[PDB]
């Protein structure tokens, strides 16, 4: 791909190296639901 760009030809590919991988009240044992955010 680098060589084609040097000659002015658009390369339809990329270098693979450029790809990046990507307490109280305990009598309510389970009644209390975690409404932490709204």
Partner 1 sequence: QFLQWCTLQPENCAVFTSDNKEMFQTESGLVVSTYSMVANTRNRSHDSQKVMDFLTGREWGFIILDEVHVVPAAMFRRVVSTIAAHAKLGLTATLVREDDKIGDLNFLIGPKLYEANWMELSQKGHIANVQCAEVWCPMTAEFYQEYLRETARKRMLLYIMNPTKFQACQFLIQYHERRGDKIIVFSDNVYALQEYALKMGKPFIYGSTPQQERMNILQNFQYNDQINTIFLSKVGDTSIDLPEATCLIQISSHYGSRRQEAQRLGRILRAKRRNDEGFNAFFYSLVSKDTQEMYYSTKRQAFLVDQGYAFKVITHLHGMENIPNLAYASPRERRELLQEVLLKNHPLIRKMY
Partner 2 sequence: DRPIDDIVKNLLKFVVRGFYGGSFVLVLDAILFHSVLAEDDLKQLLSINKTELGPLIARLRSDRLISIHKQREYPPNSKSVERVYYYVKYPHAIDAIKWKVHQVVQRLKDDLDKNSEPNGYMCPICLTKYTQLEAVQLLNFDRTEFLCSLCDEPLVEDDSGKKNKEKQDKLNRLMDQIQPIIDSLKKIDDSRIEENTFEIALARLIPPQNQSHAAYTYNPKKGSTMFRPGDSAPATLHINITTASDEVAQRELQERQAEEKRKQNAVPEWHKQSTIGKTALGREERENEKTLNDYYAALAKKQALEDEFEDV
CA distances in angstroms from 34 to 1, 4, 21, 30, 37, listed in the order given: 53, 57, 34, 10, 8
- Is 13 or 24 the residue whose CB approaches partner 1 more closely? 24
Least gap, CB of 31 to partner 1 (angstroms): 6
C-beta separation of 2 from 10 below 8 A: no
Q: Does 28 bind partner 2 (CB under 8 A)?
A: no
Q: Does 6 bind partner 2 (CB under 8 A)?
A: no
Residues near partner 1, by CB under 8 A: 23-25, 27-28, 31-36, 38
């Amino acid at each position: 791909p680098r060589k084609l760009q040097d000659l002015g030809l658009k390369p339809a590919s990329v270098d693979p190296a450029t790809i990046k991988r990507q307490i109280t009240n305990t009598h309510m044992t389970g009644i209390l639901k975690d409404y932490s955010h709204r």
